[PDB]
């Protein structure tokens, strides 16, 4: 058996609710500008599902990511694995 939650391709299609980074930090809400001010917002990325603080990939990084709630760490890849391509 595989995982319950995972991304496919580069994860631009990911619409799950994972909200922690590879180091366990909490993702910052996309609509919030604190601790990090940014432009990965629906104004610029209207198709990308930038909702709550869920891991997403609006700008075609290699895998899903988020800004973090740690003021010293702007962004990280999320703690999300790639869905098995095969059985
Ligand atoms: O830090 C950011 O907001 C951007 C890059 C950026 C830095 C400075 C100015 C504009 C863009 C990253 C987040 C993950 N993908 C690109």
Residue numbers in the entry: -4 to 82
Verbatim from the authors:
Crystal structure analysis showed that LSN3353871 interacts with the KIV8 amino acid residues Glu56, Asp54, Tyr62 and Arg69, illustrating the specificity and binding modality of the molecule. The structural data with LSN3353871 revealed a molecular interaction between a key motif made up of an aspartic acid (D) residue, any amino acid (x) and a glutamic acid residue (E) (DxE motif) in KIV8, so we focused on the presence of these motifs in plasminogen. Notably, in apo(a), each KIV repeat from KIV5 through to KIV8 contains the DxE motif. In an in vitro Lp(a) assembly assay, LSN3353871 disrupted the formation of Lp(a) with a half-maximal inhibitory concentration (IC50) of 1.69 µM (n = 43). Oral administration of LSN3353871 to mice expressing human Lp(a) resulted in dose-dependent increases in the circulating levels of LSN3353871 and dose-dependent decreases of up to 78% in the levels of Lp(a), with a median effective dose (ED50) of 14 mg kg−1 twice daily (BID) within five days of dosing. In cynomolgus monkeys, administration of LSN3353871 (20 mg kg−1 BID for two weeks) resulted in a decrease of up to 40% in the levels of Lp(a). The difference in the magnitude of effect between these two models could be explained by differences in the expression levels and metabolism of Lp(a), because the mouse genome does not inherently contain the LPA gene. These data provide a proof of concept that a small molecule that binds to the lysine-binding domains of apo(a) can inhibit the formation of Lp(a) in vivo.
